[model samples]
Target: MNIFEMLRIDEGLRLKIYKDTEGYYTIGIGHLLTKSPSLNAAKSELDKAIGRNCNGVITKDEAEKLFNQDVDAAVRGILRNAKLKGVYDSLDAVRRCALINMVFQMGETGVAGFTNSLRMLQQKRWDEAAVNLAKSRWYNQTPNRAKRVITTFRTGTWDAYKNL
Candidate 1:
């Protein structure tokens, strides 16, 4: 599957406001509205996107649009990182999507912190890269999701999603 489809399954779609795993107010396929500079501004933008006053609800089309934007942001974020850009480009499609999925959940900065893992990935040491990722607190917090991404990195395939 494509990155978008993979992320749709990983992140799950929501038509209404809900607290994410970290208790942050999120919506529409993991669009993190609360991460904006101001909560009011975020709410206003959400209001505009859904074309209505704050009702904590969004249409599927609006949600899809937001998801696309978020995925684009995640991709750009990864590419913008000087250290990650080359490594990202060197990866195959599935592995690249795995990196994008990681950035989607943790942001570029968070992914960048995986220095050793990134180095292993850069060297094309798939097993080492996967092991490095599996050693993180991110894995502790979200083992299932991390396992899938790590498996994608290791095998360079979508087999991680086969059982899901």
Candidate 2:
């Protein structure tokens, strides 16, 4: 659990994930390596990243086998740092999730981009929430993903990024 150490992952594996070797953003831990020798190397790197970003949350088994932390933290991290309404006093889970997903993808400063969406979600405006959610690059670059996740946000479904 030494947070500073960067675990070893091979060059090919790094290229695979970062360079979109197969599909865009499809480099989950499960698909990191294509051969035997590289699997261990890739898993090691994945474990290090999971431990680095998620601390003690993800187990070693999960990191190696499925790369659960990709969904656990990468997807949820943005959901965790989103903006909210009500004078910063009371915020709901939906508001939190939407903002987390946004900020997780957009970085900490994403609270501003989601200002309108946060306002609509906070007021319990379902359709408006969906509309606001679709008004970002997140929606444009990922049309289907945006529509699906935004619908879940509107209906309170927890299946956003289900296939990821």
Candidate 3:
């Protein structure tokens, strides 16, 4: 493309503020925003809206809300994609939550990629599903978390974090 058209395309694409990996604040296609809004003033308004202080850091309450919403959305997407909406809806709350948590840990696409595990779950083969999860790369990323979820899947118990 021509330079003028390419520059216009570039400017139209990036509009939100985000930080660079080294922690410098930047915005709009890597342009530094130079000035920061008063943190105290901005945080007061932010807390009023989200119920937590986030002067220059992430707010737990805000993050919590977004996390829950995203996780719930992921669960719905997975159920829809797997064509198991009714099956999932009819499951016990514990099992439902387990599936949702699994989707939350590894995104809908990631969990959906586990064909064997998804099939096991669809077949009501809890033991096999748990084994499939434990044998995957996700489990190797954090064995303790995998263990906890596996226990829940196998025993139908919450099996919360035990090792702290």
Candidate 4:
């Protein structure tokens, strides 16, 4: 229903380090720990978050904290991007959550690359935007998740959340 709930469903809780689809070391709810610029850096942050040497495992509370931080960062990144900011600001709450979900999965830069789709979204061409999103490599790689996201874009509602 809300952004956090939507993301929790989509990203799934992982209480231990694991490789994501792209093989990046991820933890919590899709937190790309490896992207911290170094393995040690990642480990240190994980340790701090979990209040111990993580040793590849995390507690639910710690994971929830990390998920919150990641979601906040994704929201900030979406708002900070010049191209996305205006479009993001103009959308209704549900559509705004959709954008946040997108940025959460694929970073702002990746979502920014969806120029045509963003344009379609900006114009409120929901069906066209969904069509554009479905044609991407992202869709090919994660069809189920992509379908839900795309469906959200198309319908401007939480109907897709039911399937998750």
Candidate 5:
């Protein structure tokens, strides 16, 4: 290896370059370093981490199920039934899924901090939901994240970055 030698992204996972790099750098997935990922890539990530076959895409089923198997159980299983139902009932499967995703990043019990966001999401309140999504104790704790997942839910758009 030389001074500027770079290793391509491996099949599995790689070290994240949140900081200590010029701006944003990561080692993974084809050594494909970019500012972010595509929706397809995002879903693939969800599939890998969960060890589920998402058919190269993410669905509501996968999202809702994630609440059970991952986030809440792992983080802090405080708000399980209601929150899960909030996701299950609203049919905002995607929205609830976003919460799950955020929770995965933050942690279930810890992600509970987004009480207002959870409520608004359950109530199908879009604007208010976005508001609550913005305010989270998670970001404060994990300042190392290159991008915040809340920003995705708030804008209803994904910036194309993910981890599995």
Candidate 6:
């Protein structure tokens, strides 16, 4: 119903640092804590991160802010990645949004590996793109998500695959 609620429902609220499903270090509301935590307090003057406590609890507002920041970064990632510009700029808003989701999941390097897939997107060959996309390891590893993305490519609409 609200940003806070949506983030909790999707990301899961965690007060303690834990390893995620992929065995990645994560804290807060699904924020991937890439850097290792300090073993000892470095200095008395050193302060904790904004919106974060030494104990690990984060307020709803804090999690909401991180959610917004991550979403913004994802959007920017889609914009700054040169490989996506060709199809991103040329497609309708819905299709473009779907591509952004794909890039967000696949990462720029991962998506770049799909040369044939990109070609299909650039050529406006939806069927070819869907087939090519489905053939990748990304699809094989995550068939449900791949099916959703492929559906987006086929229909050029986000509504059908939004839940996935």
Where's the lowest-lDDT run of ten residues in candidate 5?
1-10
TM-scores, each model vs. reference: 0.91, 0.48, 0.58, 0.91, 0.42, 0.71
| 34-142: candidate 1 lDDT, tens digit per residue | 7555556667767976677867778898899889888999988888889879889999888999999999999888988899999999999998888888998999998
lDDT of 3 at 4: 21
Q: How many pairs of residues in model 4 come into backbone collision?
A: 0
Which residue pairs show collisions in model 3?
A: none
lDDT digits (tens) for residues 1-164 of candidate 2: 11001111111122233323233232333333333335445445545654544322344454444433433553444444434334123445554454445433344555556777767766778898788778787788757646655766677654543433
The TM-score that candidate 2 achieves is 0.48
Question: Compared to the true structure, candidate 1 yields what TM-score?
Answer: 0.91
Candidate 2 lDDT: 0.46
Query: How much lDDT does each candidate structure score?
Result: 0.87, 0.46, 0.54, 0.87, 0.43, 0.62
Question: Model 3 has how many clashing residue pairs?
Answer: 0
What ranges in model 5 sit over 4 Å off? 1-12, 15-80, 141-148, 155-164
**Of models 1 and 3, which has the larger TM-score?**
1
lDDT of 3 by residue, 1-164 (tens): 22222222222223333444324343332233333454344445444544554443443344445444555575668568644464466566666666666665455677667777767876778888888878887688667656766776677655443333
Ordered by TM-score, highest first, the candidates read 1, 4, 6, 3, 2, 5
Alpha-carbon error at 30 in model 4, in Å? 1.0
Better of 2 and 5 by lDDT: 2
Write down the TM-score for model 5: 0.42
lDDT of 6 at 128: 81
lDDT of 4: 0.87
Worst 10 residues of 3 by lDDT: 1-10
Q: Pull out the clashing pairs in model 4.
A: none
